[PDB]
DNA sequence: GGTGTACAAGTATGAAATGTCGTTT
DNA sequence: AAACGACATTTCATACTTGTACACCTGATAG
DNA sequence: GGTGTACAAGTATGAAATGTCGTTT
DNA sequence: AAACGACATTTCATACTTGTACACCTGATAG
């Protein structure tokens, strides 16, 4: 009925503690469970190991084939090139693909996708960015000027922004498919300026309408009006407002370049290809990106009506937080020697 | 000092098979290991179970808490909408998100991202496809004409095709990042026509150049001329040519529409928004897509050279299979009611 | 910048499994 | 002694909870 | 259909574990 | 007898190998 290599050795422990002999136990063993029991020679050996003081009922580790390549030998490949295929590594290790699968899960390794990054910068752009951030930081060290900062940027809002569905289902079964987004589709073109205390002023352009040097100039003033009545502490300190914006063509034309001299603001330095230093981009629009995902607008009216609901829901401190992230981002901008950071 | 619930119960199997008494075994037990051993009452019990026949060393299933929901309750949720989040399913079951993660592993379930499908068809756009397939089948069934088929479309070839990187590394470590593709970067349009016996004629337009109804007209002759050299069997059968091409605007302007009548080619019916019935798309370009991935070009020259080598590498079997995938795709087209099929 | 999924550690369930101790064999 | 019979007291997977780690998402740019 | 990963069986490793003997406590 | 030394035989978790199964890619549209 009840033999078992593990159970048998347990019985040998029991006999040995009762102080019975090796051979005697082997007779009691055969008396209980019949002939199929082991030899006395093993009982003697097991007893031998008990006299040593080692009551482990499991085997010691058997012999095994030699490793065809070392763990640190694989890691050396990944050091030079983070991202290769299993079959690419397997090929370099004179081994099969699935062997490499195993070693990878055996080591601490997982597969995670790379980050997209805005642009392929040169040493040129990197030095500019680095220096700008170096400059903006040193000033913040002396005097914290973020309370004075007002920023804005412009962002397309598509009427239909479908996200790919991801469904929970039994293997081999098809998941829910979604229709692709046709680039040439209805899209308003939100323009928005804001500060640490909230959103100041925004214009949602009509389908297809955009921003030329004339339209922007007209916006800067429409802003300053709404800014005067929204921010009391401004009318006196009309020269103390710090303006942060993108280096677009309509953001440099004479007609506008002028309008900022007459408004008498301080245009903040903003390096080339630097969305990661642009509050509106990394914080405001980022947040929005989520809220917009798989959201569907039929008419401009609903878009403008959605914007308003959104902007309102947001607490003042959300925007505050976005602005007061500039310092830490500058600390990374510099630390990374001008490259993009996480 | 080697007691253990499993081991101890194993010892009572031994004493029992040595036809000793319950209170006997107990004494030997306390004699062997020490006072840290079960009471006689338990030995009396375990003996009872050895008389029924059962020698199960492990316990029977203990008391356990009641299931808050059921496995088919959750499956109902997935049957109506299979692509919810765990929190969303949890919410409906008055249970935590985590509690759902598990039950989903417990059941056979895995998460998988759905497929992109090129457009959102409406009933009219659907039935159009269904009908055009229905008809093309009914003809094929009668007589195979794919041998006469000669299709062709056009496709952009960016000079830089960057693809997101996938690295192997320890949890919480950065992966190899990639600089985004420049929408308005160098690209050459490729215009190519082919048939089951292989590529017939192609033109690689220069950076920025585009097909205008006049150009397409010219192209159709250059094709035709190139066609009768490469395909002998059309000198004789000069009206047998079947022509499958996209419903573009250049492909309908009268200047062209005449040219096709003067050449006297049977133009094949093609439904709108149906690149999944267009060999040039779903087969010939689909292949390139992989071959192009992570490939970089520097000059118009480099691309032209690569194309050739690629067209040569392709054995004639390839071109044949793409064309004769038609009847399959039609038959699925019509079966899915004009909807897209995977 | 926000969200989704799956690890890690705590609580409570509740039928085994177990100690007590006078009673029956 | 030897084993039961009721009645009390501890085990321990289990079906959840909460806390937390962390992939991967979101915004881009300039023209 | 193309490419990449991971599951499922199959196969030889090779030191332990076990057996078989003629020896010595 | 009861246990040891050699010397020959069987185990069994490994480290790999084919075959798969199967997730996700890749081509888009028309104005």
Author numbering:
A (entry chain B), B (entry chain A): 4 to 345
Quote the study that presented this structure, word for word.
To establish the structural role of flanking DNA in accurate second strand cleavage, we have determined the crystal structure of a pre-TS cleavage Mos1 PEC. To trap the Mos1 PEC conformation before TS cleavage, we created a catalytically defective Mos1 transposase by mutating the second amino acid residue of the catalytic DDD triad (D249) to alanine. To prepare the pre-TS cleavage Mos1 PEC, we designed a DNA substrate incorporating the IR sequence plus five nucleotides of unpaired TS-flanking DNA, including the TpA dinucleotide abutting the transposon end. Crystals of the pre-TS cleavage Mos1 PEC diffracted X-rays to 3.09 Å resolution and exhibited C-centred orthorhombic symmetry. The pre-TS cleavage Mos1 PEC structure contains a transposase dimer and two DNA substrates arranged in trans. Each TS is routed through an active site and the backbone is intact at the IR-flanking DNA junction, consistent with a pre-TS cleavage state. As predicted, we do not observe Mg2+ ions bound to either site 1 or site 2 in the active site of the catalytically defective T216A/D294A mutant transposase. The TS backbone twists as it passes through the active site; T57 is de-stacked from adjacent nucleotides with the base flipped into a hydrophobic pocket lined by residues of the conserved WVPHEL and YSPDL motifs. The aromatic rings of H122 and Y276 stack at the base of the pocket, so that only a pyrimidine base is accommodated, while a hydrogen bond between the backbone carbonyl of P121 and the N3H of T57 confers base specificity. By contrast, there are no base-specific interactions with A58, providing a molecular explanation for the report that TS cleavage tolerates any base in this position.
The C-terminal, RNaseH-like catalytic domain contains a DDD/E motif, conserved in other transposases, recombination-activation gene (RAG) recombinases and retroviral integrases, which coordinates the metals required for catalysis. The eukaryotic mariner transposase Mos1 assembles as a homodimer and brings the Mos1 transposon ends together in a paired-end complex (PEC) for excision.
